[PDB]
Design a protein around this ligand. Structure first.
Ligand code: NA
Ligand code: NA
Ligand code: NA
Ligand code: NA
Lengths: 206, 207, 207, 205
DNA sequence: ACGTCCAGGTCTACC
DNA sequence: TGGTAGACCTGGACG
DNA sequence: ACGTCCAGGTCTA
DNA sequence: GTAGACCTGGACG
DNA sequence: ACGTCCAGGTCTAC
DNA sequence: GTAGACCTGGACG
DNA sequence: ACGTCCAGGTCTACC
DNA sequence: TGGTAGACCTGGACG
C-alpha cells in the first residue's frame, strides 16, 4: 500500500516540490559555517516541537543563534512561543563550541560516522535530530525517524510496535528498513522521508 | 624519600624562579587566542617520542604554519626540520585542524580531567601523556605528564615496581595519583611539580 | 570480558558445588529462631573492616553469648578472642538487642530491599554492606554485598572507573545493579554470584 | 641493606647460620664419596630449587656413583626434576673425578680450585663451582645466583641484572660482596646465607 | 630483621 | 544538605 | 671510529 | 593487553 | 578455574 | 657475548 | 464554550 | 549497565 501511495506522489505535482526542497539542501555546499550552524539550531529547536514554529523562530532570529547571550537568546525564544525555551536555549549556547560545524562535519569519513559524533557531543541532539541536520545540508543516506514516519511504519506494519524508546540499535534497524523500502520506490533516504512525511501531514516542509 | 629530599633541595634554589616564571608562562594562555592554543596542541603531537627542544625549535620555525600548511608541504617543512616522524605527525596535525578552535572546545568542559578524556579519543595523535602535556602547557594545574623521564624517576625511588611497556588509562591515572601525593607532601601542583622532577633528570627547564 | 570467562569455568568446576551446598545453608534460615538470626546479624557487625574467618570462630566460641553477656564481659570476650575493635563492636551488639526478635521484624517487611533499608538507619554498626550481607546470609538473593573485595575486581575488570572513598546509597544501589546484570549474563542470583566473585580473589567459600 | 644484616646478626638466625656454616666445615673429615654427592647436588641446583635438590640428594644418596645412566635418569625423572636427562648426563660424566676431595685439596687455594672445576666439568660454572666449594667448608667464594644478585641491584650495588654473568662479571661482583663483607665483618660464606635468607626467609644450603 | 601491608565498614563531627 | 577526613584497633605475612 | 644506544608515545591489527 | 611500525640525527668510547 | 609466575644456571652454535 | 635449549610442577588469584 | 488534543525529542536521575 | 520514568513546557485548533 505505502508503495502505491508513494508511486503516485512521484507522479503527482508533489514530486516537483520535494526536489525544489531536496536541492534546497544540496546548495549548502555553498553556504557558510554560520548558515550550517543555524541549521543545527533549527534541529535542536525542532525536537518535540513544530516545523512551522521552528521555521519562524529560525527566520525571526537569524544570526541571533550565534551572537545572542544565554539570557537574551532565552528571552527571544520565550517571545516566539517555543515550548521549551530554557533548555533549548542552553543547548544553542553550549553548541557554539563547534560553531565551525561545516568544517567539522565535512572532515569525517562519511555521513554515518559524522552523525555518531553530533549525537554524543551535542546535548540536545539524538539520532533523530542529527539525521535531520545531515539531511538538511545535503546528505542522502540518513533517515529521520520521528513520530510521523514511525506512524506510517507501524501503520503499514513495517514495524511491530511504536517503540516506547529508540535505542541506537533500533534506530539503525529501522533506518535500514527505511533504506530497503527506498530501493523499490527508487528514492535515496533523504527524498523518501519528505514523501512519507507529506503523506502523514500534507506538507513538504523539511 | 631521597627524591623528596632533592625536591625541597631545589625549591630553595635559583631554579625555583625559572620554574616559577615558566609556570606563569603557561598561565598566560588564559588570554591567548584559539590559534596560540592549537599551535600548542601540535607542539605536543610533535614531541611524542621526540626531543622536547627538538619540538620547541620546529614550533618556532613553522609558527602559524600549523594552521595553514597543506599536507605535502608541511611534511616537507618537517622532513627538512629534522623531525623523526614527519609523515605521520604531519598527517595527525592536519586532521586535528577540524578542531582548529581548540580553546572553545576545552574551556567548555567542566574540569581539566574530563577535557582530557575528550582530546584523547577525538584526536588521533594524542594519548594521555601528550594531552596532559597539552593542557598543562596552556595553564591547567592538576594533570601529570607521565613520560619516560618522570617514569624511571618514580621507579628509581620505588614509587612503582616496574616501567610498564604501555600505559593503561587506569595505569596512567594510578601513576598520576601517585604524583599528586608527592605534590601534597612537597606542597606543589602537578604542573609545578613536573618541571621539578623533569629537571632532576635532564638539567634543563624547557617544557 | 575476562571476568565473564573466569565465572563460567568455575560453574563447571568443583567450586560449583561448594557454593551450592553453601547457598542452601542460608535458605535453611527459614526454619530458625530469632536468636539464631540475631547471632547472624551479630556476625555481620563483627565483619565490618575485619576478617570473614575471624568472625566465624568468634561467633562459634561465643555462640549464644551475644544475647546474655553484659557489655563489660562481651567486650572482654571480644578482646580476648582477638577482635580489632573489641569496644565499639561490643556496644553495637548490645544496642541491637532491642530487636532480639530480628526474624519477626525482617520477615514482616513485604520484601528484602525494603527490609534492608530498615536495618541500616535503625541499627548502629550496620551499614548498607553488612546489611545486605546479613540478608544474604539468612537466605536472601536479590541483594549484593559490595565489600573491599568484590570492589577490587569490578574495578580491575573495568566495570567502574574508581574505588570510591565511601559508598553512598545511590552508588551502592547503582553498583549493586551493575552486578545484577553480570548475574543474568551467566545466570546466577546475586547471593550465589557474590560467592563466585569472592572465591576468585580470596580463594575460599565461607559466608 | 647493611642495617638489615645487622638486625639478622642480632636475631636467633645468627645462631642458625653459625651451626649451618659448621655443617660445611665437617667435610674436612668426609670421604671422596661424600664430597662428590655435594658436587652432584650442586649440579642439581642450577636453574632449579634448593629445597628440591636436597630431598633428591637424600633419596638417591650414593646412587650418584653406582647407578647406570638410564637408571639415574629415571630417579631424576620420577623425583620431578626439571631436567632429568641432562643432569643425569652431567653427573655421570663427572664420575671421572669421583675422588673430588683429593683433587680439590691438592690445589693451592679455593680461587684456583674453582677454576679447574668450572672448565673441567660440564654442568658446572662459577655459581655452581662456588656453591660446591662453600658447601664443603671453603670460605672466600661468592655464590652469585638469582637472589644475591636481586638484592645487589635493588640496593644499588650493581646497575643491571646482566643477561650474561661473565667470569669477568662473576669476579667483580664477587669482589663487591667481599667489601660488603668487611662492612658487616662476615666471611663470603656467612654473608651469602645472610643475603639469601633475606630474599627467601629460609636458610638451607 | 623491623617495618610495611592488610583484613567482606561504620561512626561521629565538621561545614 | 551530603560528602569526607579521622577514629575504631589488632595480629599475621612477608621480604 | 663505525656501531650502539637515546630522545616528554601513539596507532594499527 | 602488546609488538611492530613510524624514522632521525647525535653523542659516546 | 586455568594461565601466568617462578625456581641458587649451564650448554651449544653462530 | 647471547639466543634456545634443557623441561617441570606448585602456587596463586 | 472551554477541557482535550497534539506537535519532526532529548536530557537527568536512578536502579 | 542500558532501559524507564518524568521533566522540559506551550499554543492553537477542535466541536
Ligand atoms: Na546528544
Ligand atoms: Na587519540
Ligand atoms: Na547503621
Ligand atoms: Na663447566
Amino acid at each position: 500500500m505505502l508503495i502505491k501511495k508513494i508511486e503516485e506522489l512521484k507522479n503527482s505535482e508533489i514530486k516537483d516540490i520535494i526536489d525544489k526542497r531536496i536541492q534546497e539542501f544540496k546548495s549548502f555546499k555553498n553556504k557558510s559555517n554560520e548558515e550550517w550552524f543555524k541549521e543545527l539550531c533549527f534541529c535542536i529547536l525542532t525536537a518535540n516541537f513544530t516545523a512551522e514554529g521552528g521555521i519562524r523562530i529560525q527566520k525571526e532570529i537569524g544570526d541571533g543563534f550565534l551572537t545572542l547571550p544565554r539570557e537574551e537568546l532565552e528571552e527571544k525564544l520565550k517571545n516566539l512561543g517555543h515550548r521549551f525555551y530554557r533548555k533549548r536555549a542552553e543547548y544553542i549556547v553550549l553548541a557554539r563550541r563547534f560553531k565551525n560545524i561545516k568544517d567539522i562535519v565535512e572532515s569525517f569519513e562519511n555521513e554515518k560516522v559524522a552523525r555518531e559524533f553530533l549525537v554524543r557531543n551535542i546535548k540536545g541532539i539524538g539520532y533523530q535530530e542529527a539525521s535531520h541536520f545531515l539531511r538538511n545540508v545535503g546528505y542522502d543516506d540518513v533517515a529521520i525517524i520521528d513520530r510521523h514516519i514511525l506512524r506510517e511504519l507501524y501503520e503499514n506494519n513495517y514495524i511491530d510496535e511504536i517503540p516506547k524508546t529508540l535505542s541506537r540499535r533500533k534506530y539503525l534497524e529501522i533506518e535500514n528498513i527505511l533504506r530497503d523500502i527506498g530501493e523499490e520506490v527508487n528514492l535515496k533516504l533523504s527524498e523518501l522521508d519528505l514523501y512519507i512525511w507529506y503523506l502523514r501531514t500534507g506538507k513538504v516542509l523539511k
